[PDB]
Paper text:
We have observed this phenomenon first-hand with human 14-3-3σ, a protein which has several hundred known interacting partners in the cell. For example, the 14-3-3σ isoform (but not other isoforms) specifically targets p53 and is associated with tumour suppression, making it invaluable to determine crystal structures of the target peptide with the correct isoform.
To address this problem, we present a combined co-crystallization and peptide-soaking approach to obtain crystals for any 14-3-3σ–peptide complex that may exhibit difficulties when crystallizing under our optimized ‘sigma’ conditions. To demonstrate the experimental reliability of the method, we considered this approach for peptides found in the PDB where co-crystal structures were published with isoforms of 14-3-3 other than the sigma isoform, since they were not able to crystallize under the standard ‘sigma’ conditions or any of the other hundreds of screening conditions tested. Not only does this significantly reduce the production time, but new 14-3-3–peptide structures that were previously not accessible with the 14-3-3σ isoform, despite screening hundreds of other different conditions, were now also able to be resolved. The new strategy that we present here has allowed the determination of several new structures of 14-3-3σ which had not previously been possible, illustrating the ease and success of the method. In addition, the method retains the robust, stable, high-resolution and well diffracting features of crystals originally grown in the sigma screen.
Author numbering:
A (entry chain A), C (entry chain A): -4 to 71, 78 to 231
B (entry chain P), D (entry chain P): 29 to 35, 391
C-alpha cells in the first residue's frame, strides 16, 4: 500500500485533518493505511474509519441514484448505462475494500462487544450498499450476507450492551432499514424499530445528560422512520 | 428511502 | 489520454450526466477528453469545461484554506505541513492541467470575442488560484501572468462586447477580486467594480427579460463586493 | 475573502 511508509500515528492525525477539510477519499485512504498496520483500532479510530467510508460511499450512492433514475426514464445510446455502470463498479470496489479490511483482520481480532458489534454492523452496512445495486442471484446471496452480519451483531448487542448503547441503537436502526428497503419485510422493520425505541426509552433514566443526548439522537431516527413507514 | 445512521 | 477511445459527443453527454450526479472530477475528465479531440468548443461546451474545473479546484481551495489555517495556528510534527503540501500540489496540478488545455490549443484557435474572452478569463482565474498558494519570486511571476491574461480579456471585451454581456461582467468581477485579494490593490478593485456596475446599469434598458436576469445576477456580486470593501 | 463568479 501507498501508506506503508507512514507511521500509524501520522495516518490517524492526517485522517483527522482530512475530515476537517472534508477530504473523505483521503481520509479513507489514511484509515485504510492505519488498519493495514495490523493493530486493533480504538473506539475513536473505528469511528474515523466509519466516517471516512460512509462519506465516500454516500457520495457514490447519491450519484448512482441520480444516474439510475435517468437510465430508467430513458427506458420508458449506451452512454447513460455505461456511466451508471462506471459509478456502480467504483461503488462496489469501495464496498469490497471495506469488507476486505473487516475480513483481514478486524472482525477476527475484535473480542470486546463494542468492537465486534461495530465491525459486524459495518459488514452489514457495506453488504447492504452492495445489495442496493445488485441484480439477480448475486442479489440474493448479498442480501443473505448482510442479514447474517446484522443478525450476529444483534445477538451480541442484546447480550452485552444496554438498550441505549449508541452502537446497539445504530445497528437496530440500520437493520430496520435493511428490512424495509432491501429485504421486502416492512413489518419486520416496523416491529424492530418499535421494540428498539421502547426498550431504549425505558433505559434512558440510567444515563448521564451527555449519554442521554447521544441515545435520543438515534432514537429520533427510529421515530422518523416509523412516521415514514406507518 | 429511509433514515439510516448519519454518516458522521 | 484514457478518453481517447470515446466519441466526442459521448464525452459531452457524460459530462452533462456527471454534472447532474455532482461527480465533478469525472465531469472534468470527460471535458478534458473532449478538448483533446482538437475541435473548438461551443458556448455550452465551454461552460461545461468551466463548471467542471471550477468545482474541482473549488473543493481543493476550500480544503487548502482549512489546512493552511490549522498550520498557521500550529505556528503561533510535520503532518499538517505535509498534508497541506499534498493538497497544494494536487491543486497546482489541476490548475496546470487547465492552463495546458488553454495553451494547447483553445486560446490560439479562439477567434470570436466570446470564445477568446472566455478562455483568457479562465487563464486569469487559474493563475489566480495558483497565486493564492504561491510564495516568493514565483508568486510575482504567477501574479503577472494572471494580470496579463485578465488585461487582454478586458481589452477585447471592452471593444467587442456590450457592458452587460455576462462574460464581460464575470471577467470584470474576477479581475476586481484579483486586484483586491491577490495584487494588494483594493482601490483598483473598488474602481473597477464601480465603473463596471455603472456602465452595465446604463445598458440594462437594451436587454430582454432573460438577459436582464443574467446580467443583474452578476452585477449583484459586484455590489456585494463593494459592500464588503467600502 | 471576496465573491468571484459562481462555480456553476
Ligand atoms: Ca485480540
Ligand atoms: Ca401489518
Ligand atoms: Ca479558427
Ligand atoms: Ca481610497
Ligand atoms: Cl463511462
Ligand atoms: Cl500527506
Ligand atoms: Mg511505527
Ligand atoms: Mg454492473
Ligand atoms: Mg468521432
Ligand atoms: Mg508547495
Amino acid at each position: 500500500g501507498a501508506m506503508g511508509s507512514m507511521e500509524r500515528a501520522s495516518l490517524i492525525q492526517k485522517a483527522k485533518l482530512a475530515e476537517q477539510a472534508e477530504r473523505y477519499e483521503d481520509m479513507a485512504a489514511f484509515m485504510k493505511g492505519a488498519v493495514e498496520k495490523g493493530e486493533e483500532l480504538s473506539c475513536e479510530e473505528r469511528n474515523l474509519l466509519s466516517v471516512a467510508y460512509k462519506n465516500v460511499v454516500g457520495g457514490q450512492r447519491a450519484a448512482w441514484r441520480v444516474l439510475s433514475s435517468i437510465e430508467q426514464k430513458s427506458n420508458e445510446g449506451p452512454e447513460v448505462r455505461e456511466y451508471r455502470e462506471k459509478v456502480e463498479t467504483e461503488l462496489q470496489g469501495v464496498c469490497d475494500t471495506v469488507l476486505g479490511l473487516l475480513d483481514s483482520h478486524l472482525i477476527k481480532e475484535a473480542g470486546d462487544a463494542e468492537s465486534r458489534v461495530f465491525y459486524l454492523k459495518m459488514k452489514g452496512d457495506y453488504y447492504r450498499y452492495l445489495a442496493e445495486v445488485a441484480t439477480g442471484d448475486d442479489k440474493k446471496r448479498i442480501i443473505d450476507s448482510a442479514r447474517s452480519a446484522y443478525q450476529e451483531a444483534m445477538d451480541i448487542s442484546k447480550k452485552e450492551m444496554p438498550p441505549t448503547n449508541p452502537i446497539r441503537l445504530g445497528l437496530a436502526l440500520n437493520f430496520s432499514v435493511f428490512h424495509y428497503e432491501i429485504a421486502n419485510s416492512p413489518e419486520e422493520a416496523i416491529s424492530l424499530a418499535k421494540t428498539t425505541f421502547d426498550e431504549a426509552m425505558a433505559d434512558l433514566h440510567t444515563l448521564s445528560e451527555d449519554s442521554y443526548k447521544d441515545s435520543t439522537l438515534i432514537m429520533q431516527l427510529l421515530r422518523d422512520n416509523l412516521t415514514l413507514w406507518t | 428511502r429511509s433514515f439510516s445512521e448519519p454518516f458522521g
